[PDB]
Amino acid sequence: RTAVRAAATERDRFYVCPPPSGSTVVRLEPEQACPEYSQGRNFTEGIAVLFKENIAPHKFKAHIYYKNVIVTTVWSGSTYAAITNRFTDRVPVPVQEITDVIDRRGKCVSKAEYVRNNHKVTAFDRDENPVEVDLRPSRLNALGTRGWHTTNDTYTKIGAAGFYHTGTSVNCIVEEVEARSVYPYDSFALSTGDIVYMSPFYGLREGAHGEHIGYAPGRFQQVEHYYPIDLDSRLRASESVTRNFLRTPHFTVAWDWAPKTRRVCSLAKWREAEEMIRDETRDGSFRFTSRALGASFVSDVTQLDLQRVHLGDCVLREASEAIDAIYRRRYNNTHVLAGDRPEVYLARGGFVVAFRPLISNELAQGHLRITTGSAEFARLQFTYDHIQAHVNDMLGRIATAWCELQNKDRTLWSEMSRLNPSAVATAALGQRVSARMLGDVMAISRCVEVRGGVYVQNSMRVPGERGTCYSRPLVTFEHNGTGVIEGQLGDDNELLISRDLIEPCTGNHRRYFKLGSGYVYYEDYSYVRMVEVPETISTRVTLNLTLLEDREFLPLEVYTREELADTGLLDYSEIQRRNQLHALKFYDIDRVVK
Amino acid sequence: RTAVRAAATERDRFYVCPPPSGSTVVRLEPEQACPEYSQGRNFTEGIAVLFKENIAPHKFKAHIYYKNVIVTTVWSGSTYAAITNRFTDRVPVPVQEITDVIDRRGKCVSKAEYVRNNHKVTAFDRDENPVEVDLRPSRLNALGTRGWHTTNDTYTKIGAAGFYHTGTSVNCIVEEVEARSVYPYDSFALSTGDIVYMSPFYGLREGAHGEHIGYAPGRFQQVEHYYPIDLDSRLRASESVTRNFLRTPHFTVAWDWAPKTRRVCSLAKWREAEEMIRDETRDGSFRFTSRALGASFVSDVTQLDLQRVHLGDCVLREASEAIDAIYRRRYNNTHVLAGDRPEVYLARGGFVVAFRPLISNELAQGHLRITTGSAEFARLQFTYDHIQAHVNDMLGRIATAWCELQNKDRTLWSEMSRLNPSAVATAALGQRVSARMLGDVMAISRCVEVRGGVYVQNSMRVPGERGTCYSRPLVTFEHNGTGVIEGQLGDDNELLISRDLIEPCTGNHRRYFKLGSGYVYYEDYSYVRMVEVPETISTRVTLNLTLLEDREFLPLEVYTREELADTGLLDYSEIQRRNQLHALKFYDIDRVVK
Amino acid sequence: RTAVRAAATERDRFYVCPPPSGSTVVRLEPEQACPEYSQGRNFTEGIAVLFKENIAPHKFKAHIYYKNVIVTTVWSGSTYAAITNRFTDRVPVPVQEITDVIDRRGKCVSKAEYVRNNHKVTAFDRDENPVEVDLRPSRLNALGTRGWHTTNDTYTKIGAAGFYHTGTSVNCIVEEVEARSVYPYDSFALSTGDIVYMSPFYGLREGAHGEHIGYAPGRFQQVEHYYPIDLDSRLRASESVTRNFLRTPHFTVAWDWAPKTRRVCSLAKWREAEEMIRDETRDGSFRFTSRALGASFVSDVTQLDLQRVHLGDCVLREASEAIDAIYRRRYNNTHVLAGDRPEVYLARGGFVVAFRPLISNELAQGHLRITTGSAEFARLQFTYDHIQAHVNDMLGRIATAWCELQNKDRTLWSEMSRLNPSAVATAALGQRVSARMLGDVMAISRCVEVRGGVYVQNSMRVPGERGTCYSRPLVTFEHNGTGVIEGQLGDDNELLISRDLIEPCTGNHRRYFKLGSGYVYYEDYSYVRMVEVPETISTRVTLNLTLLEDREFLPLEVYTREELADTGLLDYSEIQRRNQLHALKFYDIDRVVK
Ligand SMILES: *[C@@H]1O[C@H](CO)[C@@H](O)[C@H](O)[C@H]1NC(C)=O
Ligand SMILES: *[C@@H]1O[C@H](CO)[C@@H](O)[C@H](O)[C@H]1NC(C)=O
Ligand SMILES: *[C@@H]1O[C@H](CO)[C@@H](O)[C@H](O)[C@H]1NC(C)=O
């Protein structure tokens, strides 16, 4: 009939629970309203053709006609000859001579009649009389680089010693040439290095005449219904052309006249987006997403008027073509196109989007200069948006289910609140409380810590009654004023003010009761030992979520600025640097003879 | 009083539950410690100005002064004239003549006095006496490309037949020219194609004299307090300059002298980051994140000393300007700048970050050559980090709530463990067990499978007692040694060793008892049929999480390397290729006359 | 003994629950099968070397040998001299003279003997007799740009007035030159601006002879066992070479012959991936992921045969080198390489991947033209894949735990279904139902709304019995036909058909009963007031998931197309534009003398 002193730790403290009066009354919180997230997105399927700023020059075929005049002064000596001069000059071939000699016969006159220093001057091949010479192809002739000439020889004079002799070579040259024009196209340059200070689209028939010409009107001429001739097979072409001719002091250049608007565009077809999705979730903007491309393009809801664009005719033409070609190939039997024409938008970063919506059979029943850079932002827009939408959708789904689960699981908590309102209110409040059901509502009283040392009684027998025992052990403790309380060991370290927990005594009685950090072992209503229960059972579900690791994105380049500038056979600046030093490098230019 | 043989499937097996002794005792696992993830990040708001490596040349205005000497040899014939020679040469205009004739009067002398082949030589326009000729503007004169000349004519000699005549043209030319200097700036080049082998910042006053000059000291001269004159309105400028003059063998070039450090910088302003956030979560590094830019820049915690940078003066100057301008515009009333100066860092990929922290009013109370490439890594750093931080934060939040929920829900499991310790321990252990509460701890015994065929008894009446019935059906089975057991059908296919489940008989008795894969139907304490219960009730919450789909990022380029190299009017290498073939193409250079 | 009219709102409606017959019987839905997501990925560790398309020209050292012939015509006057002509021409130095005079003595003959206009011509320095002159270095000589010449003077004739005098300068020049060849390498260009129309790898020994030569066979020559000499220290090199010589009309160029396959490759080493992971999860493809690089490269499972590549010899050579070097440095003691050679693949976007798997010590016991652009797609592939895999893994983990948790928590629901089948079935069905356990299955009946006004009875005393009271209040209501029902207030607004809920009366009786939107207060079995219970207790766990915000990725470029084209000292096209205007700008070319 002795006593064992109980031991309490912080976490495993003893508690007294004063009876709850109706002073504080609580209800179990009703089911919450669940978060409803964006279920369904607003969009349009279609076909798109993306256009970029045209950066390429206007390229066209042309012919250069000139006579290569070389004048050589030789000083004939005793046992040698020395070139004292070799003066070279390209001279134009008149239009008359092109059409009437060169096209007509494939011959060229052995003389030149041109203006130099404002004086009318002449040059005769071999210092001889004019003869129409045949134009023979060069040995080096190749596709797009054919040339014809009249001589393989450069005339030089063979004379008497102690004299200066002058010979004159005249080689008539016709060359297939490639021309290039860079915006605004007020000039062009030929494969020969010659720049023509005139518009390639300059003509005399209306529209064309309001194009630049840096040359006097007499230097230019057009020849309508001109049927070109091959200077090898001397055959004419089946279709005629308006042939432009410009006579400069060093050559005559010819090219086929064509109207600017047909030949040139300020924009260029970049890519086709066969499965283009136009998103309409964000307001006042469209977002053109392409799975194929891995790119999103943001534009306004309002269309681009292509009349604002200088030379934007190619857009609608090339866009309708590819869209119509795609439709035929991919949607002909499943869908129908919308609105008898494609829609055109100005997307972020200088991209022009020509989009045409796809309608399923079932649902059918101020001047602008567009500058384009990279499409790097658009792929990033794509990547980000694809992930953001997914994780947003999925967390939405978790949030709702978390709410829904807790709402359902309230049935379990209400049911427990009828039976054990205290353990429910302790879980809810997160602090040790005593509770009583006052019908359909709980009365709450807080539980207070027992600081004065607690002692367990060795026997569990009712003193004065055989056959009746106490179900849980007896304790002695200090709470409030009364220094000693004849109490009982309740549940989860609650000490009971009274001793009313009873049971008829049973044979082979084994009990483990929680007492502080551990357990007290009782055998046949008598204290035995202070045991430990190290074995546990868990109804928990493991959720191991690991973190998304740090990643370092270091600068990465396939080719550098240096590598990209070093691809050429020659570098103008590098050559000039070295070349312009030649006089200072191999001569004393600073010395002066007295 | 017959029997029906029960049918067990794998999943719906019969079990016998031996009584649990205190041999194995368990506790319900206490509430766990919950994961606490990084709640709050360390950062600094501010304003930044990003600087990139200067790739642009130093551009400045200049003037070229030369006399264009053309000497023509004409051979007058019977009925013609032929140019046998036309020798062209640019000659310098002496400084004396620039200041005393050209600036003073707007005139130029009709002769040239220069050195060629180390000999002092002269050239007279029209082979006549020296006259100061007025400089008239060219017809083609435009903004930044003005030129003045003295003649429109090229003098040629008109003489007697059978003779060689020589005429001399001298055109004095002054041209507005644009100059460019590329690092290290020891030379410059003019719009005319001429390279000047000297520093644009070379002077004679201290500092400037230790700059390259590839020319003899006599060829150079500075003119202090020089007031320039317009050669059209012959008005002088209000402010004077130090005027540099360099006389080369072919021209005199003049330019305004300026000190290198003022005019040139090795870095260039790239972008302003108005809302720059400097992250301080990772140690030994700063991360400059810009929402505006969509870029993160990683640098050291230690500042960049701009004294390590060759020509880094522009940085602090231009950074303070833009930061101060931004502050005035965006933060003037809400915040205050910090530390009387902006901080400077060397970020990853060659970016210089000039950052100045923003302090809210409430909180206020070895030589370096910087190489820059792309900012592609920085946008990727940004994207990745923005997503990683969000998903890490959100999963952290799920992890904690999962722990917290299970911790709360332990109140429900403990409560059940008092009432039904077996069903709790079976859920926990994940295997069929029998359990008994030994006070505050459970005794566990495992349940064993009944392999010997089971039979249900047709009646549920107590033999020998009217008015008392068995609550659940009677069974017969084989377990351990004893071949026949007079048992009862327990819960969820548990077969009971005994027959102690009793109830006073009731009128209109209908029962469905689980027996193997299905149910046994009993009516008024008598077997009827083997029914199926196909209807279910579920308290589950659906969570449909779908996977983030695979995405293919295919190579994408707006303009190729080819497209970017093809934008020019001429290509030096292409022209040279064709041009240097001309002799081989239109002549036989290999033939020799015997 | 009066009555108070109850008030019902939508959400807090009154219900009558008809008794359930076995008409509808339900079971609680058994535990579900849980989703099992991809646990474990298939991959190979190794080392990789990435190769890109070679964009760089073939660069090699060379020497240019020529004699700079200048012929000057001076007209001596009264008090002056005028240059009437200055004709410049570069002439070749014969191979004989290079080896026998220039290499042998470091001297060059003061005359030139060359062919011009098909005529054999001579040039004498100072119009004097041939002398072997020493080659002296230029003042400007620098590393890689050395030059040697024979004179600093340009010979001019000083004569009698009224006469034309002609002088001849011959300067023999040898220059260290840099050569460049661009694919297909059928020509090369020198630092001087000269293009050599021949292959740098053309030779006469087998293999080399099937390479382009645009020159007659006599113009070329190889010199085997040639030991070069420094023209400063007149020392010979220790190792000999096969020396190529090509005599063009303007110079002799020499270079060391080397075989094409050794000197040139169509691919170039880009980066080393020390920790390259080759993923094998997607079928019919490999994915080469590099943490270091932040890039993923997609290729076929089938290797690249490098015999399909024109000049692909560098790949295997350079790949084995770096891989073997890396292994030695990082894996020598932990792993072993696999398969006696590296594997080679053709990745997406023109990248060649040379991968060699790493085997841990423990586990050991048609013609192709490759075009490369950017690696932008590969970093995006990397970023996306890294995130996708993580979030997919983590949601998988949530999905399984959600299933597992609900499966466990079924133990709680079954247990409640025995005690309160109605509250379980109401939670499950999401509608108010009455339920009865018919053994191991529930009988369900739906609950109907009470529309006819309800009234609570002021007393809770059993009329006719003292000491016995009703536990819950009495009500009067209208349901079905019977206009008045002597009922009782049940749980959660259920009205009971009968009045069988009883309790022995207790002293100090306080009760709150739910009645519609609120509560009814009862004191000592008598009505008092209609109270409100505003205080709640919650067992809910907060889960605050916020959305991933929209981000705008705006176009961002470090340097523009314009900025990148403006880095050069000169621009060929810009210079030519201005230069070719000179005649039109400073002269009247259109005027003609009559
Ligand atoms: C040049 O010479 C070749 C023969 O070597 C000949 O075929 C060709 O027709 C000649 N061309 C001219 C224009 O004389
Ligand atoms: C050139 O001629 C035009 C008239 O055609 C005239 O206006 C201009 O002043 C002249 N220039 C010179 C330098 O003679
Ligand atoms: C050129 O002159 C310098 C002296 O000014 C001298 O050192 C050099 O050797 C000379 N070169 C030749 C080739 O005469």
GROMACS .gro file of C-alpha atoms in nm, chain A residues 571 573 577, chain B residues 55-59 180-182 189, chain C residues 563-571 574:
model
   22
  571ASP     CA    1   3.867   4.125  -9.536
  573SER     CA    2   3.981   4.660  -9.386
  577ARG     CA    3   4.560   4.833  -9.361
  649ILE     CA    4   3.204   4.697  -8.006
  650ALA     CA    5   3.141   5.025  -8.200
  651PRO     CA    6   3.429   5.225  -8.349
  652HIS     CA    7   3.509   5.581  -8.239
  653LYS     CA    8   3.343   5.806  -8.497
  774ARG     CA    9   3.635   5.589  -8.775
  775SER     CA   10   3.885   5.446  -8.535
  776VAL     CA   11   3.891   5.089  -8.415
  783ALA     CA   12   4.002   5.568  -9.169
 1751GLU     CA   13   2.574   4.714  -8.430
 1752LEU     CA   14   2.742   4.384  -8.542
 1753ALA     CA   15   2.789   4.513  -8.905
 1754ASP     CA   16   2.938   4.842  -8.782
 1755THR     CA   17   3.251   4.707  -8.599
 1756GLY     CA   18   3.496   4.742  -8.891
 1757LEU     CA   19   3.744   5.015  -8.976
 1758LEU     CA   20   3.619   5.026  -9.338
 1759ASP     CA   21   3.308   4.903  -9.518
 1762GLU     CA   22   3.016   5.235  -9.821
   0.00000   0.00000   0.00000
